[PDB]
RNA sequence: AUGAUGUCAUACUUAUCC
RNA sequence: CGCUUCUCGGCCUUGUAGUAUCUGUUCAUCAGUUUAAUAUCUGAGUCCUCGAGGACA
């Protein structure tokens, strides 16, 4: 009465989204069509868990919260800390707070419509895929080269990398400005 | 108050071993549940290392039976003489000897 | 493993649990054997004994 | 926990210490009852839950076997009774098919709850019989309860009738009709029919207004008893008609139709109680007839109504009383006829000291007299009853006093002439000067009289206020509070007539009593001051605010429920209105004193407190006072904190939050957790109050919600989610949806949990997010979860999908994806694929 | 003998991957990870 | 609500009787149970307001003085277009407080 | 190395309530 | 190659409802019920001796 997962994956045009719990549904064809939509979002990962999505962060004691630059550039945090130290007033300004709230307003980092909150969502700070020919600033500092990164001197001798065959890096077969020395 | 939990008893034993014996105010500033007199009473009653909390024999029962008639009151005077020195095990043993011999 | 909270409480880092009073963190020393679970991290940090 | 010396008989099995060796161990462990009966409140709580979850385990048999004796105990308490009632409820929310053998075995103990002096006992009883009947089956109830109909004792018959009333409210009238309609035609014996008719009545009382649809069938049942040879059946019958018509709101008159012609005839020939009963029925009927037919019929009833005033029966007097209300309160009745025929005997026989001492007779008398005033006019009634204000007894004076009160409330004082008005004011003062008990009736009475008289009262003031001051001494404990309140309610009258000397008097005189040590007095004093502030303005206060307010400031320690109330109120009025007269230093001191007023056990105290704190927040400006809020230790878990949070909200409103937010958002940094969730709440209420203005600050709060919604501990996810809710309703339609989608990501994993507050929180969250984002995105998160046969994901995603489904069901159409058609069914909707 | 730990982890479960050189798996997650592995991809590349 | 979670509403048919609030429960909302942003008035059912049931509070059930209103957050969330929210049941509230 | 249950404190919520 | 003393230096003195994280606690073989996966009711050569041992097929 219930089809197997291989028969459901062979019949579906997009078999990279089928799960093991979708065979126990009442209509796998409609679920497979709805799961393969263009702008659809998946369900949360707490459907099979037993921690109720809030009991996993028991021993994690990180920073409770961080204030923005528009609030830190007003001097209210230091005055509040001085008042808390005196209790355990300021009257700095009235137009500077309005200027920090209107003119010096910083747009926060929002998220995508499909960017749902994961369980941990703090130890997986993934970011695109900084590949061959493109590096971050600081690691430039450790490397200490003034404005090729010097092991692309040895990418001369030993050859183009097996891992990224399509590679071009400056000065060799790739005829470079700022950070990015290969594409 | 004075529930005398096991985690508080271990902290009181560590404070008696680390700070000292004749400093009750120094031991009461690291528990946040009892006063200095209650901590000293607990250290002299249950947290003392010389307290014989077990091994009730017939020689001690005969010693306590031959002492409760000579002195009916003042059980604290017969605490160190009998050898229990807990000031509550003597009354409990007297109650057990009075209940078992009554039937 | 003893860590202080921002409200006057203790929190165990190795046991990854909360402590209500000062006696609670002082009773997770003999107990809460997270020290025996550090042998895997010690073997991962150093392959030799 | 301890055993009373009698309860041993029940709990003896627990006393023996033999232990650890089947059913005998279930009865033995069932003594947790004892923990419910006697013990500490926590033992009762935990025990109660433990036995709730063991219902399905132990079964109804052992429980009731071990309970019904206790609830049957001759020594039973009040509380213990009520508690056993609670356990019976809570176990009967679960057990359904199981209770069938025990239903009667339950009701026998429970039916005595329906007839009781305690009201709460009665509403409980009706509730648990509702749960039992609905819990069991109809046929279970019916087949159960028959033999109690013909039972010799009438007690069980009666309480059984109310039982059928309750079960009929449960399972509805039409289901139970054929049973009844069969009963009232039973030819065996009369007692049955008497019972069934009583059942008709108690159904009338219980269901009340909702009888309406089946009224016809019910009447068609009952009608055959009016002519029966037995008397009771006739009496209780017509009574049941009465109850019907009384629940029969101005309609279904023709349904009673065929009933009338016998009744009227009976009106002639009857002696005794049955007569009065008919008068009750007809009485409630007449308002439902036509003023033409009811003209004749009424004019016939008036005769007997007159003749029957004089009977010593108090049942009689109740009936004929309410009758006189309905008959003579008819728009189709002529004044002069009442004025002549009725009023003199009415005030003769009915106004006497037998009546007033009773309760129901008191009330009903008040009402009837009020209506007679409503027709014949004011000066008549009042003019006849004024002389009784000076009568000795209290309760009688109280009666005529509240009567005058309601009368002058409705008709207005304009009708009253001069002399009778002198007798009025003197009467009211005189009666007011002797007060045996403390009560509103005399006070509200006086106030309404004066405010109704308007400025016709002006010549009488000096006598009034002379009495007010002299009484304002006499006895502080008893009468101080009362004379004070008298001032409070007479303020406006002492104002508009422009007697300024009197305002000087009350101002400084009352000013002097603020050192009174008795709280119950002082409260009334502050109240009086309040009322005086609302008439004479700020700058004209005879005790200039510079004097007054700092004199008020120290009183806030007073603990007292009335002092704190009125005090905080007045500090609110002055702090809101003038607010300049007092220097800022005084104000900030007021703040640091206000901070601990939030320990109040009363909600209105905190109310006025927070609103004041907002007012003075306007008087000064935000930063300092919101810092003083952030000083808070949070020390109390059960509330006592979140009121400060509310102050943070309202403070953030009073001057633009456009200023305040950075301080707060910085103060989330602090490692102390409970204040972290505190400032989360502050954001919640904050957006709830700001509404539209959040079109900007959304961004500012967004990353912090990210940090909070990412879970340190559940309360973070909960409160933050509430913030997402109120933000989501507030920002609607302004085009910020993007960041709300981002936050919805982090919201989404929290869907799964059993904690009630976090799951209902998340529900509110996703509902607000539904309206703000639009359904399409929601549904795109809710599709795949439907399918899941796992006993969890489907439960939840279907709960969500329902929440999304009920609202905006109209707009969902476009977003259902394409679903291919199988063999037997065509799942493609081709209408959308028609192309021009 | 960790019987409950092996039952909760999913051990002693009948599973086999014919693409990964007809190997057997002691669990469904192990069968899912063995279908996309180095040996399974090597056998798929050697099969063509 | 947040104070009483076991209380059930009436949810009957909406009539023409305007709802009222008691002096102890003045300003509190019926659904949202808030004190700010009143947008829509409260309407009572026909059976819920008849004779002695008229002029009573919806939430408190005591003597109503001022007319009750619904919150704007409940109005925008379409929580005010439901049935008459008259408090019919009264459980685990004001029962043991009468004994003390 | 999560999770399991159970004796047992500790915080938190419900504007909980005389 | 081992051991004792002495010196110098690197240095540590209230009434009710519900929730979790702490800490003690531990996780006889087929078939189906159930459960996310877990547990479960029911199922299984002769003789002798006190589940075990021996003998025979």
- Structural domain tally of chain D? 1
Cβ atoms of D121 and D80 closer than 8 Å: no
- D689 domain-assigned: yes
- D611 domain-assigned: yes
CA dist D732 and D770 (Å) reads: 10
For residue D788, give the 3-state DSSP assignment. coil
* 76-95 in chain F: CB under 8 A from chain D: 76-78, 89-91, 95
CA dist D427 and D387 (Å) reads: 8
* Cβ–Cβ below 8 Å for D669 and A122: no
Q: What resolution does the deposited structure have, in angstroms?
A: 7.8
Contacts of D721 (CB under 8 A, 6+ apart): D709, D747, D750, D758, D761, D762, D764, D765
CA dist B53 and F73 (Å) reads: 67
State which residues between 666 and 705 of chain D bring their CB within 7 Å of strand G. 674, 677
CA dist A111 and A93 (Å) reads: 34
Angle between helices D756-773 and D737-747 (to 10 degrees): 150
CA dist F48 and D249 (Å) reads: 13
Cβ atoms of A98 and D621 closer than 8 Å: no
Partnered with residue F67 across adjacent β-strands are F20
Name the residue among D267, D378, D387 with its Cα closest to residue D327: D267
CA dist E36 and E23 (Å) reads: 13
* Cβ–Cβ below 8 Å for C22 and B10: no
- D424 domain-assigned: yes
Distance from CA of A95 to the nearest CA of D (A): 9
CA dist D777 and D740 (Å) reads: 11
Cβ atoms of D181 and D147 closer than 8 Å: no
Q: Max CA-CA distance within chain F?
A: 42
Mutation target vs D (from A76, A94, A112; most D CBs, 10 A cutoff): A76
- D829 domain-assigned: no
Name the residue among D688, D605, D618, D616 with its Cα closest to residue D646: D688
Residue E13 (CA) to nucleotide H45 (C1'), in angstroms, measures: 34
Cβ atoms of D662 and A76 closer than 8 Å: yes
State which residues between 10 and 29 of chain E bring their CB within 7 Å of strand H. 10
CA dist D532 and D519 (Å) reads: 20
Angle between helices D500-513 and D519-533 (to 10 degrees): 150
Instruction: Name the strand (E) or helix (H) holding D401.
Output: helix D394-410
Lookup result for tokens 């947008």: F39
CA D711, D714, D719, D724 dihedral sign is: positive
CA separation, residue F41 to residues D432, D733, F71 (Å)? 40, 24, 9
Cβ atoms of D578 and D621 closer than 8 Å: no
**Tokens, residue B10:** 């271990």
Question: Can you list the pairs that B23-32 forms with residues at least 24 positions away whose Cβ atoms lie under 8 Å?
Answer: B30/C22, B31/C22, B31/C23, B32/C21, B32/C22
> For residue F12, what is the nearest residue in chain D, using CA coordinates?
D210
Is C38 an 8 Å CB contact of chain A? no
CA dist D647 and D643 (Å) reads: 6
Instruction: Count other Cβ atoms within 10 Å, centred on residue A47.
Output: 20
Instruction: Name the strand (E) or helix (H) holding E5.
Output: helix E3-9
State which residues between 13 and 42 of chain C bring their CB within 7 Å of strand H. 15-20, 24, 27-28, 31-33
For residue E25, give the 3-state DSSP assignment. strand
* Cβ–Cβ below 8 Å for C3 and A64: no
CA separation, residue A175 to residues A40, A135, A145, A179, A183 (Å)? 43, 19, 20, 15, 11
Name the binding residues of F.
10, 22, 25, 29, 32, 45, 48, 57, 60, 71, 74, 84
CA dist F54 and F63 (Å) reads: 10
Mutation target vs C (from D637, D666, D667, D672; most C CBs, 10 A cutoff): D672
Phi and psi of A151, rounded to 5°? -85, 0
Q: Answer for C44: CB within 7 Å of strand G.
A: no
Domain boundaries, chain B: 1-51, 52-103
CA dist D567 and D523 (Å) reads: 7
**Tokens, residue D359:** 């309760």
Contacts of D475 (CB under 8 A, 6+ apart): none
DSSP state of D479: I
One-character DSSP codes across D551-605: HHGGGGG---HHHHHHHHHHHHHHHHTT-SSS-HHHHHHHHHHHGGGGG-SSHHH
**Tokens, residue D35:** 């923990």
Q: Which nucleotide has the shortest C1'-to-CA distance from D42?
A: H16
* Cβ–Cβ below 8 Å for D120 and F95: yes
Q: Answer for C41: CB within 7 Å of strand G.
A: yes
Is B11 an 8 Å CB contact of chain C? yes
Phi and psi of D665, rounded to 5°? -50, -35
Task: Say if strands C2-4 and C17-19 run parallel, antiparallel, or are unpaired.
Answer: unpaired
Cβ atoms of D391 and D431 closer than 8 Å: no
Which spans in chain C are helix H? 22-25, 39-45
Lookup result for tokens 């004044």: D335
CA dist F67 and D33 (Å) reads: 46
Q: Is D311 exposed, middle or buried (0-12, 13-18, 19+ CB in 10 A)?
A: middle
CA D770, D775, D781, D785 dihedral sign is: positive
Name the binding residues of F for Zn(2+).
10, 22, 25, 29, 32, 45, 48, 57, 60, 71, 74, 84
Range of the structural domain that residue D137 is part of: 1-817
CA D675, D679, D685, D686 dihedral sign is: positive
Contacts of D605 (CB under 8 A, 6+ apart): D564, D565, D568, D597
Lookup result for tokens 């990398």: A161
Residue D783 has its nearest CB partner, among A40, A74, A91, at A40
Question: Can you list the pairs that D376-379 forms with residues at least 24 positions away whose Cβ atoms lie under 8 Å?
Answer: D376/D335, D376/D338, D376/D339, D376/D343, D377/D335, D377/D411, D377/D415, D378/D407, D378/D408, D378/D411, D378/D412, D378/D413, D378/D415, D378/D416, D379/D415, D379/D416, D379/D417, D379/D420
Cβ atoms of D47 and D67 closer than 8 Å: no
Chain H bases closer than 7 A to any CB of the protein = 14-25, 27, 35-39
CA separation, residue D644 to residues A144, D597, D681, F53 (Å)? 54, 11, 10, 38
Q: Answer for F35: CB within 7 Å of strand G.
A: yes
Cβ atoms of D622 and D652 closer than 8 Å: yes
Name the residue among B44, B52, B34, B43 with its Cα closest to residue B10: B43
Partnered with residue F43 across adjacent β-strands are F18
CA dist A55 and D750 (Å) reads: 11
Lookup result for tokens 């959308």: D832
* Cβ–Cβ below 8 Å for C17 and A58: yes
Residue B55 (CA) to nucleotide H50 (C1'), in angstroms, measures: 40
One-character DSSP codes across D616-666: HHHHH-HHHHHHHHHT-----SSSSSHHHHHHHHHHHHHS-HHHHHHHHHH
CA dist D797 and D784 (Å) reads: 9
Contacts of C7 (CB under 8 A, 6+ apart): D634, D671, D672, D673, D674, D675
Contacts of D705 (CB under 8 A, 6+ apart): D683, D720, D723, D724, D743, D746
Partnered with residue F17 across adjacent β-strands are F44
Question: Can you list the pairs that D223-226 forms with residues at least 24 positions away whose Cβ atoms lie under 8 Å?
Answer: D223/D258, D223/D259, D224/D184, D224/D185, D225/D184, D225/D193, D225/D197, D226/D259, D226/D262, D226/D263, D226/D266
Contacts of B39 (CB under 8 A, 6+ apart): B12, B15, B24, B27, B28, B31
Name the residue among B64, B47, B68, B48 with its Cα closest to residue B4: B47
CA dist D668 and E48 (Å) reads: 60
Q: Answer for F33: CB within 7 Å of strand G.
A: yes
E-strand stretches of F1-100: 14-18, 20-22, 38-41, 43-45, 64-67, 69-71
Name the residue among D655, D667, D570 with its Cα closest to residue D628: D667
Cβ atoms of F84 and F11 closer than 8 Å: yes
Q: Is D99 exposed, middle or buried (0-12, 13-18, 19+ CB in 10 A)?
A: buried
Subunits adjacent to chain A (3 or more Cβ pairs under 8 Å): C, D
CA dist A115 and C34 (Å) reads: 35
CA dist D112 and D74 (Å) reads: 13
Chain D residue numbers with beta carbons less than 8 Å from the beta carbon of F22 are none
* Cβ–Cβ below 8 Å for D729 and F37: no
Tell how far CA D258 is from the center of its chain.
40
Cβ atoms of D647 and D655 closer than 8 Å: no
* Cβ–Cβ below 8 Å for A68 and D665: yes
Q: What is the CA radius of gyration of chain D?
A: 35
Q: What is the dihedral of CA D624, D626, D630, D633, to 10 degrees?
A: 90
**Tokens, residue E12:** 């002693």
Chain C residue numbers with beta carbons less than 8 Å from the beta carbon of A58 are 16-18
CA dist D289 and D260 (Å) reads: 11
Is A32 an 8 Å CB contact of chain D? no
Instruction: Count other Cβ atoms within 10 Å, centred on residue A162.
Output: 7
Residue E13 (CA) to nucleotide H46 (C1'), in angstroms, measures: 39
- D826 domain-assigned: no
Contacts of C14 (CB under 8 A, 6+ apart): C1, C32, C34, C35, C38
> For residue D658, what is the nearest residue in chain A, using CA coordinates?
A101
**Tokens, residue D188:** 């065996």
Tell how far CA D14 is from the center of its chain.
43
CA dist D408 and D452 (Å) reads: 7
Q: HEC states along chain A? A: CCCCHHHHHHHCCCCCCCCCCHHHCCCHHHHHHHHCCCCCCCCCCCCCCCCCCCCCCCCCCCCCCCCCHHHHCCCHHHHHHHHHHHHCCCCCCCHHHHHHHHCCCCCCCCCCCCCCCCCCCCCCCCCCCCCCCCCCHHHHHHHCCCCCCHHHCHHHHCCCCCCCCCCCCECCCECCECCECCC
Partnered with residue F40 across adjacent β-strands are F70
Instruction: Name the strand (E) or helix (H) holding C3.
Output: strand C2-4
Distance from CA of C5 to the nearest CA of D (A): 6
Cβ atoms of D586 and D615 closer than 8 Å: no
Name the residue among D701, D803, D712 with its Cα closest to residue D750: D712
> For residue D670, what is the nearest residue in chain C, using CA coordinates?
C6
Phi and psi of E23, rounded to 5°? -80, 160
CA separation, residue F49 to residues A167, D169, D208, D283, F46 (Å)? 82, 18, 11, 22, 5
CA D523, D524, D530, D536 dihedral sign is: negative
CA dist A108 and D700 (Å) reads: 6
Q: Is D20 exposed, middle or buried (0-12, 13-18, 19+ CB in 10 A)?
A: exposed
For residue D183, give the 3-state DSSP assignment. helix
* Cβ–Cβ below 8 Å for A67 and D745: no
CA D456, D459, D465, D471 dihedral sign is: negative
CA dist D445 and D482 (Å) reads: 13
Tell how far CA A150 is from the center of its chain.
29
Cβ atoms of D164 and D142 closer than 8 Å: no
Chain D residue numbers with beta carbons less than 8 Å from the beta carbon of A86 are none
Instruction: Count other Cβ atoms within 10 Å, centred on residue A112.
Output: 11
């Amino acid at each position: 009465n219930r089809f197997t997962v291989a028969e459901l994956k062979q019949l579906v045009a997009r078999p990279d989204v089928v799960e093991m719990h979708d065979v126990t549904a009442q209509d796998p064809k409609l679920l497979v069509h709805l799961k393969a939509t263009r702008n659809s979002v998946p369900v949360p990962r707490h459907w099979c868990f037993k921690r109720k999505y809030l009991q996993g962060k028991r021993g994690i004691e990180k920073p409770p919260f961080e204030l923005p630059d528009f609030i830190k550039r007003t001097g209210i945090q230091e005055m509040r800390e001085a008042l808390q130290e005196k209790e355990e007033k300021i009257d700095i300004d009235y137009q500077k707070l309005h200027d920090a709230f209107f003119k010096w307003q910083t747009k926060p980092k929002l998220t995508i419509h499909g960017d749902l909150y994961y369980e941990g969502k703090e130890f997986e700070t993934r970011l695109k895929e900084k590949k061959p020919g493109d590096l971050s600033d600081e690691l430039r500092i450790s490397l200490g080269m003034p404005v090729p990164p010097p092991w692309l001197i040895a990418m001369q001798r030993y050859g183009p990398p097996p891992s990224y065959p399509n590679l071009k890096i400056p000065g060799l077969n790739s005829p470079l400005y700022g950070d990015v020395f290969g594409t | 108050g004075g529930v005398w939990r096991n985690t508080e008893d271990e902290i009181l034993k560590a404070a008696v071993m680390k700070y000292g014996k004749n400093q009750w105010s120094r031991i009461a500033s690291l528990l946040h549940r009892k006063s200095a007199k209650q901590c000293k009473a607990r250290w002299y009653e249950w947290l003392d290392p010389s307290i014989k909390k077990t091994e009730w024999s017939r020689e001690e029962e005969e010693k306590l039976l031959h002492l409760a008639k000579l002195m009916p009151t003042q059980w604290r005077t017969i605490a160190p003489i009998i050898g229990r020195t807990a000031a509550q095990c003597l009354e409990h043993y007297e109650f057990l000897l009075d209940k078992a011999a009554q039937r | 493993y003893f860590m202080k909270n921002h409200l006057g409480s203790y929190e165990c880092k190795l046991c990854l649990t909360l402590h209500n009073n000062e006696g609670s963190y002082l009773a997770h020393t003999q107990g809460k054997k997270h020290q025996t679970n550090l042998a895997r991290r010690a073997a991962k940090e150093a392959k030799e004994a | 926990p301890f055993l009373k010396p009698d309860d041993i008989q029940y709990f003896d099995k627990l006393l023996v210490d033999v232990d650890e060796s089947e059913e005998q161990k279930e009865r033995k462990i069932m003594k947790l009852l004892l923990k419910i009966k006697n013990g500490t409140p926590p033992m009762r709580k935990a025990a109660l839950r433990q036995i709730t979850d063991k219902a399905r385990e132990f079964g109804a048999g052992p429980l009731f076997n071990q309970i019904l004796p206790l609830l049957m105990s001759p020594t039973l308490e009040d509380q213990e009774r009520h508690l056993l009632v609670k356990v019976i409820d809570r176990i009967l929310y679960k057990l359904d098919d199981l209770v069938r053998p025990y239903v009667h075995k339950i009701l026998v103990v429970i039916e005595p709850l329906l007839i009781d002096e305690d009201y709460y006992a009665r509403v409980e009883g009706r509730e648990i019989i509702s749960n039992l009947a609905k819990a069991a089956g109809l046929a279970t109830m019916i087949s159960t309860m028959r033999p109690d109909i013909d039972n010799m004792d009438e007690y069980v018959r009666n309480t059984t009738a109310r039982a059928f009333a309750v079960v009929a409210s449960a399972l509805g009238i039409p289901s139970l009709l054929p049973f009844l309609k069969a009963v009232c035609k039973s030819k065996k014996s009369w007692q049955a029919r008497h019972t069934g008719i009583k059942i008709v009545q108690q159904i009338a009382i219980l269901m009340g207004c909702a009888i309406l649809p089946h009224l016809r069938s019910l009447v068609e049942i009952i009608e055959h008893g009016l002519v029966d040879e037995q008397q009771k059946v006739r009496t209780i019958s017509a009574l049941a008609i009465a109850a019907l018509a009384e629940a029969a709101t101005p309609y279904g008159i023709e349904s009673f139709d065929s009933v009338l012609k016998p009744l009227w005839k009976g009106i002639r020939q009857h002696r005794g109680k049955g007569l009065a009963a008919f008068l009750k029925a007809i009485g409630y009927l007449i308002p439902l007839m036509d003023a033409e037919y009811a003209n004749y019929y009424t004019r016939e009833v008036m005769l007997i109504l007159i003749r029957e005033f004089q009977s010593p029966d108090e049942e009689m007097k109740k009936i004929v009383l309410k009758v006189v209300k309905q008959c003579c309160g008819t728009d189709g009745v002529e004044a002069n006829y009442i004025k002549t025929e009725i009023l003199p005997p009415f005030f003769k026989h009915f106004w006497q000291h037998r009546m007033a001492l009773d309760r129901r007779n008191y009330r009903q008398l008040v009402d009837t007299t009020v209506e007679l005033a409503n027709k014949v006019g004011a000066a008549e009634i009042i003019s006849r009853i004024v002389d009784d204000l000076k009568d000795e007894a209290e309760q009688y004076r109280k009666m005529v006093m509240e009567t005058i009160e309601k009368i002058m409330g409705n008709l207005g004082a304009a009708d009253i002439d001069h002399k009778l008005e002198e007798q009025l004011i003197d009467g009211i003062l005189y009666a007011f000067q002797e007060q045996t008990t403390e009560d509103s009736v005399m006070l509200n009475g006086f106030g309404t009289v004066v405010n109704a008289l308007g400025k016709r009262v002006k010549p009488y003031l000096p006598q009034i206020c002379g009495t007010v001051l002299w009484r304002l001494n006499n006895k502080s404990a008893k009468v101080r509070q009362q004379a004070a309140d008298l001032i409070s309610r007479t303020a406006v009258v002492m104002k508009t007539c422009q007697e300024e000397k009197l305002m000087g008097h009350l101002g400084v005189v009352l000013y002097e009593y603020l050192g009174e040590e008795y709280p119950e007095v002082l409260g009334s004093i502050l109240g009086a001051l309040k009322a005086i502030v609302n008439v004479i303005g700020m700058h004209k206060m005879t005790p200039p605010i510079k004097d007054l307010l700092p004199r008020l400031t120290p009183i806030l320690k007073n603990r007292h429920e009335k002092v704190q109330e009125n005090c905080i109120d007045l500090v609110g009025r002055i702090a809101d209105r003038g607010a300049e007269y007092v220097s800022a230093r005084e104000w900030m001191r007021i703040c640091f004193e206000l901070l601990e007023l939030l320990k109040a056990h009363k909600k209105a105290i905190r109310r006025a407190t927070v609103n004041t704190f907002g007012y003075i927040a306007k008087a000064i400006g935000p930063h300092d006072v919101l810092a003083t809020l952030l000083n808070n230790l949070k020390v109390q878990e059960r509330q006592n904190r979140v009121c400060t949070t509310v102050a943070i909200a309202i403070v953030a409103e009073t001057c633009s939050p456009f200023t305040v937010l950075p301080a707060l958002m910085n103060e989330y940094r602090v490692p102390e957790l409970n204040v972290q969730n505190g400032v989360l709440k502050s954001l919640s209420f904050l957006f709830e109050y700001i509404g539209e203005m959040g079109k900007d600050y959304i961004y500012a709060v967004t990353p912090l919600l990210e940090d909070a919604l990412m879970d340190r501990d559940l309360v973070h996810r909960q409160t933050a989610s509430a913030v997402v809710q109120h933000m989501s309703l507030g920002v609607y339609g302004f085009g910020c949806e993007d960041s709300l989608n981002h936050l919805l990501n982090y919201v989404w994993p929290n869907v799964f949990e059993t904690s009630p507050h976090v799951i209902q929180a998340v529900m509110g969250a996703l509902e607000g997010l539904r309206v703000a984002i639009g359904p399409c995105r929601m549904l795109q998160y809710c599709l795949q979860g439907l399918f899941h046969p796992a006993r969890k994901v489907r439960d939840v995603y279907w709960k969500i999908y329902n929440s999304i489904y009920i609202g905006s069901q109209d707009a969902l159409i476009a977003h259902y994806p394409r679903i291919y058609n199988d063999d037997k069914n065509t799942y493609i909707r081709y209408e959308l694929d028609y192309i021009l | 003998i960790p019987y409950w730990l092996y039952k909760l982890h999913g051990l002693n479960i009948n599973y086999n991957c014919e693409i990964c050189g007809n190997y057997t798996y002691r669990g469904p997650k192990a069968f899912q990870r063995h279908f996309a592995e180095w040996r399974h991809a090597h056998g798929m590349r050697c099969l063509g | 609500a947040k104070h009483h979670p076991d209380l059930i509403f009436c949810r009957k048919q909406a009539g023409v009787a305007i709802g009222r609030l008691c002096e102890k429960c003045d300003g509190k909302c019926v659904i949202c149970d808030s004190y700010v942003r009143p947008c829509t008035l409260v309407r009572i059912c026909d059976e819920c307001n008849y004779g002695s049931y008229q002029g009573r509070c919806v939430i408190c059930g005591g003597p109503g003085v001022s007319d009750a209103y619904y919150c704007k957050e409940c109005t925008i969330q379409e929580k005010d277009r439901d049935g008459c929210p008259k408090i019919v049941n009264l459980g685990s509230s004001k029962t043991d407080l009468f004994y003390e």
